[PDB]
């Protein structure tokens, strides 16, 4: 067996490239998983020289989007090198899904059911799933749009579960209010939405004509590296997570950051007064900047609560920290990861929060328990991003294995798997409808996914480097994208969703040029955050790095 793997793979490589061009582009999908599963089985059975020869002969006929995985594999030559990788260990035990059409599968099975190639047929039916759809064979630039992950292009039986992608309060896609036990709406929280709809009165309709104004909030000195930004829902606070293990809150309105008075000062005043909150504020402590200490590592996540208290921060030391914004101290340290927590976010109702880390899970916490409630443990690499749905019944977790996964908060089940990115996903955002999801990664592609159909609905390919920030407008009219090419691109998020299967795919339009409303370049400044004011004004924050 092992000395003739360069005869099995080169025989199937000769069959596919000699096929007709309609089936050739679809049968080129099983070049990459058959190259890795034959290479990893050689190095697991301690056949290093043969493994090295196979890698040298076939690595360069692999698709260009796979270079990073190919480099990790070139390093892997021993068995014990792979026994502690835990990403190729989970790749060897899982099954590549490999969605192919029935018109091309008949040519494949008429070349594998014969005894002439019963060995490569034995590897296919051991290591590869094949998910068959009845339809046209896809084009090469459509197959290129939806592949790219390891154990990628998942089954349609995963993307057929019922997802309550509607907003709460009739919408038939909306979940009930008692599905997830969400917290009560207090009179101070009801007072927030009264002044929120005064901002909505001045909210402009953006569209492709009235392009929004962008106010860049640059961090000027920032010689400790800025790693996390968050803005409150009303543009009042801006948090900064830095590499010197600090969180720094800035007030952007002309209203200094005050702490509440100490317990001796609150005991002498009375409650039940109308002023109460005003009475409690301390004016002795009033700055335009509050520095928060306590992480022993670079703060990677930053998340405000919707009631403008309760800053959240996660860092390299494996803890998620809940900072008060009334006392400006730390309250809780959530130690569930032993590994760098790459992101955290509060729920849009403010009770639960999700944190994704290097240990390839995302935990669901509740700010009341020292232990999590849900563990979302299906990714094969680091959970880079963690985003809540606008109804907070679903959590989207992008990751470094080039997949985006929706997770139901009930039962912890993965209800959607979105594959088609070529690099690790570094930004997710939801549409304000709740129907759509924009994801960005290191390939500079912004892929727009449907959530009810579990189908990608568009691909935005204007950016060059890693797209690290996405946000839709408050109306949903414009998706704003910020990346490391120091550009803030605006995309038409209405013309991108004009059409709303069983083939499990739609013919993507190649329409990025018509969906770009504008590109604005920053002065040597990577756009770390993008925020939309409730009057539809774009805010962006990024450390100025002269580089």
């Amino acid at each position: 067996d092992p000395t003739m793997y360069e005869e099995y793979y080169s025989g199937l490589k000769h069959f596919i490239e000699c096929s007709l061009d309609c089936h050739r582009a679809e049968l080129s999908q099983l070049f990459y998983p058959l190259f890795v599963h034959m290479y990893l089985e050689l190095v697991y059975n301690q056949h290093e020289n043969e493994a090295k020869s196979f890698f040298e002969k076939f690595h360069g006929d692999q698709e260009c989007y796979y270079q990073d995985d190919l480099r990790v594999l070139s390093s892997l030559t021993k068995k014990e090198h792979m026994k502690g990788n835990e990403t190729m260990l989970d790749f060897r035990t899982s099954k590549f899904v490999l969605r192919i059409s029935r018109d091309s599968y008949q040519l494949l099975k008429r070349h594998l059911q014969e005894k002439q190639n019963n060995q490569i047929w034995n590897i296919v039916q051991e290591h590869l799933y094949i998910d068959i759809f009845d339809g046209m064979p896809r084009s090469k630039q459509q197959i290129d749009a939806m592949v790219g992950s390891l154990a990628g292009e998942a089954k349609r039986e995963a993307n057929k579960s019922k997802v309550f992608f509607g907003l709460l309060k009739q919408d038939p896609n909306a979940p009930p209010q008692n599905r997830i036990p969400l917290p009560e709406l207090k009179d101070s929280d009801k007072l927030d939405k009264i002044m929120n709809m005064k901002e909505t009165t001045k909210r402009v309709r953006l569209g492709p004509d009235c392009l929004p104004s962008i106010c860049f909030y640059t961090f000027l000195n920032a010689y400790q590296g800025l790693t996390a930004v968050d803005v409150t829902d009303d543009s009042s606070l801006i948090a900064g997570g830095f590499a010197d293990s600090t969180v720094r809150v800035w007030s952007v309105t002309p209203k200094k950051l005050r702490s509440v008075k100490q317990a001796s000062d609150l005991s002498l005043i009375d409650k039940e007064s109308d002023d109460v909150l005003e009475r409690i504020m301390d004016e002795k402590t009033a700055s335009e900047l509050k520095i928060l200490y306590g992480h022993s590592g670079p703060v990677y996540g930053a998340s405000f609560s919707p009631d403008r208290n309760y800053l959240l921060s996660s860092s390299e030391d494996g803890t998620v920290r809940l900072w008060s914004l009334q006392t400006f101290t730390c309250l809780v340290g959530y130690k569930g990861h032993n590994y760098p927590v790459w992101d955290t976010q509060f729920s849009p109702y403010g009770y639960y929060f999700v944190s994704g880390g290097h240990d390839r899970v995302a935990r669901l916490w509740a700010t009341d328990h020292y232990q999590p409630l849900r563990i979302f443990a299906g990714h094969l690499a680091d959970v880079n991003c963690t985003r809540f749905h606008p109804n907070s019944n679903y959590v989207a977790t992008g990751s470094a294995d080039r997949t985006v996964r929706l997770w139901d908060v009930l039962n912890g089940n993965c209800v959607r798997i979105f594959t088609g990115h070529k690099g690790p996903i570094h930004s997710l955002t939801f549409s304000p409808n709740g129907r759509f999801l924009a994801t960005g990664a290191t390939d500079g592609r912004v892929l727009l996914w449907d959530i009810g159909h579990g189908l990608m609905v568009g691909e935005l390919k204007g950016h060059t480097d890693t797209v690290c920030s996405l946000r839709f407008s408050r109306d949903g009219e414009i998706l704003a994208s910020g990346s490391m090419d120091n550009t803030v691109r605006l995309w038409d998020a209405i013309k991108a969703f004009e059409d709303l299967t069983a083939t499990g795919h739609i013919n993507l339009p190649e329409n990025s040029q018509e969906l770009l409303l504008g590109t604005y370049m920053t002065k040597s400044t990577p756009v770390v955050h993008l925020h939309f004011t409730r009057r539809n004004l774009v805010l962006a924050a990024g450390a100025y790095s002269p580089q």
């Binding site: 100490q262 317990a263 001796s264 609150l266 409650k271 006392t327 569930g336």
Partner: protein, 196 residues
Amino acid sequence: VASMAGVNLSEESARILATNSETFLLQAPLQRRILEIGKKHGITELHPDVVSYVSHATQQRLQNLVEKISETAQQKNFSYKDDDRYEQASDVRAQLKFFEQLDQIEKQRKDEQEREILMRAAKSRSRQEDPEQLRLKQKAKEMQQQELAQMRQRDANLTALAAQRITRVNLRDLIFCLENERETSHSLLLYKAFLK
């Protein structure tokens, strides 16, 4: 012992004086335990001084960990407020007592608002149809005030008739002594202990 000025020598000699300032494994099931793992390597029999050496090695592993979790389980039993060399700097917990009083006041306010809304539901010279919740519920409010009077005369009738600190080690103290040492810092036994 190989290092004469070794740095873990001064640790557990000053740790013991910090705790002063406030296993012997079974030989019969252990000897079967060593031999079964020896089948996977070809170590078919063992030396008779090994099964008591591993028992002395397991003791100095856990005694180095029982002493380590005892000096952090007594770290929480140091009350500063009895001493008056220390001064309080920032109490968030009394601010929380203030919050609890404020929340009781808010709940009282909400009850008053609900009563006002019920009264409005049928405001007239005479009680009005179904929304006349004022006629019955307001009488009940008066009944509830009469019931409070009870919680105050029971405090009066009975008055007229009348006329070595123990240290408990939590799972936090064991987890705190696992992520610090190099072994069991990135281990599946500490990772699972975060959920126990």
